[PDB]
Structure formats: C-alpha cells, structure tokens
C-alpha cells in the first residue's frame, strides 16, 4: 500500500498493533471483543465474562437478588475480584447506582451459575435506561448490534465463564475468534 506522488515524494503507511498489551489484561484493565452480533467477551486476567443481549430473561425480582449498591454484587459472583470487575463494567455502561433501576443477579449460593441481568427493554419505565445501557455497549464494543425490538422486552445478561450458566459458549472455539480491540479498552478507561 505505497504509491508515488512525485519523482521522490511517495505515499507510505504503517499499521500498529496493541495486542502485546491487550494480552496482559486484568480486571482493572479488561480486554473487550465482539464475537457474534449477540456474544461479547470481557477478559480481565483470570476472570472472563460473556455478555449477551437477547429477549430471554431467566431472573425475576420476586425471586432473585436486587443490586442497589456495588457491594451487593458480592452476592452474584464466586469471588470479590469478579465483583469489582463487574462494578467497573457497570459504571462503564453508564449505570447509575443512585438513580437507575437496580439490576438483578442470581445468588452465588445457587447451582445454576452467575447471571447479572439488565432490563434494557424499549418500553415503559425501562426505555430510557435501556438506550443508555446500549450506548455504553456501543462505546465498549465497536460494531455493537441492537437486536432489541420496539415495544418488546430486551435484556443484557452477564455470565462469568466457568459457572454452569456459561454453558459451552466460553469454549476455545469462541474466544479464539474474538479479536481484541484497543479502542474498546480506551473507551472503558474513559467511561470508568
């Protein structure tokens, strides 16, 4: 990709890679990548998190844990390291621990695995909040897809890889085809 303008003047280019730095990821320094138009991944060192955007909610506020404060996230994940990782991610999405609706998660004591749920439905008291959380996603994942249908339900689900709730989606066939993008990490740094 180099051509000549003048007899000596020449068009030249250079391509940079941040992968040697994105590989040294950690909870405070997450590497963010997009797989499907429905699967996203955050690698924070030893803790990997699958993020999904669907219309399928498995949690209810009448049965599951409501997270009003970051500390409540300790009830959602097997380790507190992951708890603060998800705290910083929630901040990065634009969630307001003081004003926005509380998110839902599954008590870590249960058998089904970790699952944090955001109601991003385009309807009723979930509409406004919803858009924000999608904007955050658009900032944190280049090329984010908006599968949420107007007037219908939509949810963002976070599952820590390793728990039963990750199913087989955290396998090697997935994370090996999820190129890290440093622009996402820069947006995470700025928004948190």
């Amino acid at each position, epitope marked *: 990709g180099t051509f000549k303008i003048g007899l000596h003047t020449e068009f030249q280019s250079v391509t940079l890679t941040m992968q040697r730095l994105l590989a040294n990821h950690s909870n405070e320094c997450p590497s963010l990548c997009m797989l499907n138009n429905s699967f996203y991944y955050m690698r924070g060192g030893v803790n990997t998190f699958l993020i999904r955007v669907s219309d399928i909610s*498995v949690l209810m506020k009448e049965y599951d844990v409501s997270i009003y404060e970051p500390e409540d996230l300790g009830n959602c994940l097997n380790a507190s390291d992951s708890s603060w990782a998800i705290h910083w991610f929630s901040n990065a999405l634009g969630h307001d621990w003081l004003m926005d609706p509380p998110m839902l998660c599954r008590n870590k004591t249960k058998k089904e695995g970790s699952n944090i749920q955001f109601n991003i439905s385009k309807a009723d008291d979930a509409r406004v909040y919803g858009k924000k959380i999608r904007n955050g996603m658009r900032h944190l994942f280049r090329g984010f897809h908006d599968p949420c249908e107007e007037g219908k339900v939509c949810y963002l689900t976070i599952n820590q890889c390793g728990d039963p709730s990750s199913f087989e989606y955290c396998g090697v066939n997935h994370l090996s085809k999820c190129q890290f993008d440093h622009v996402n990490t820069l947006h995470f740094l700025v928004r948190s």
Partner: antibody
Amino acid sequence: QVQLQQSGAELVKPGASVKISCKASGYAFGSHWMNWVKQRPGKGLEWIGQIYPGDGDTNYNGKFKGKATLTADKSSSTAYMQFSSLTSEDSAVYFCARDDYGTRYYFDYWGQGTTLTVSS
Amino acid sequence: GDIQMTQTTSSLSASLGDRVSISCRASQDINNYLNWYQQKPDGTVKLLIHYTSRLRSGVPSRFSGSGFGTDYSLTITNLEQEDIATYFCQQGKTLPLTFGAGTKLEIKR
C-alpha cells in the same frame, strides 16, 4: 413437552427396601432440582427431599433422613428414591416434581405418582 | 423449627358459578413465597399460582391469589365444573418445604 413418568405401583413386605424411579423428558435434567413428595389420605403433602442431578447434591427433610435415599442418572435422565426398612407407615403415594430454572422452590411439573403398599 | 401451613377448611361446598375462597395460614412470615397446587380426583397435580398471585401459563383468569405475611387466599370466581378438585398451598421461603393439608371442593345441590 415436559414430562415426568414415574414407575408403577409396588407391593412389598415389612422390612423390605424399594427403589422408585422418575424419568424426565423435555428439559435439561441437570439444571433443575428434582423433589419428592409423600401423600397419604388425610395427611396432606410431605416434602421428602430434593436432588440436583448436575452435581448430585441432596437436601433431605430431617424426618425422612435415613428412610429415603435420592440418586440420579443423567444419561437416562432418571431420578430414583430408595426406601429402607419399610413399614406400614410408609404406604403412600410418592410424586416426583421439578423446580423451575434457578431455584424458586415451586414445583412446576409433577409425575403421575407411584403407589407403595407395605403389608404382610 | 419447621414452618406449618394451615388450611382450616378441609371441605367446601359451592354451586357452579359461585365465588370460592380458600384460606392458607403460615406459622411464620413467609414473605409472599406461597404457591397453590390443584389436585384432580385422578391424582394429577398441577401448579396454578406462585408467589401469592402470579398465575401460571394456561391457568384461566377466574383463578387469583392474594395475601401477604402469614395469611393468604386462593379465589375462584365463576366456579366451573372442572375446578372441582383439592387445592393445596405451599411455602417456598425456607427448607424444609411444607404444604397445607388441602381443601376439597364439592358441588352444592
């Protein structure tokens, strides 16, 4: 589509053991708690225990601890309840029931029941 | 330490099209974690209402649940023939899970 098919009626003599079965269909057997319930005329419904076929953890009711033993087989998607030292007090109808995804402690799908009679 | 469920009425007579109420009382506050089951005369069992008043899919609208604390109630308006059955309540707060004794509905004449 979700179905729980229990084994047939049993007639045993005192002091005997017996294993009743419950075959599940239509869902991930390892993702739902399988509970057992005992019914007798005029004695309502008694909760015996529950097993999680995923890891195999069992939670028993203190009253039935020692009388009942719960096992599971994921390949056959079949839960089993074994009774030991049966007495006439153990004659009843036994249901297997399923909790919903997660652990909501409500039984959304029931088997047809298995009649156990203990008599000399 | 167990939690006792009390369905004071064991039998209840009513004519088709009536409003029926079945009470359920808990020995401890169970925080709306009450569920209602229907048992037909053939032994069939089905969940109808969970968390006090949340209807399950397929349950006709004439069924409804109410209460909070220790006292709860299942209400059946416009009693249909197929509703003639026995109804049990169940607390889902703490193990061991416990059921009521049941309330059988019978037709009046």
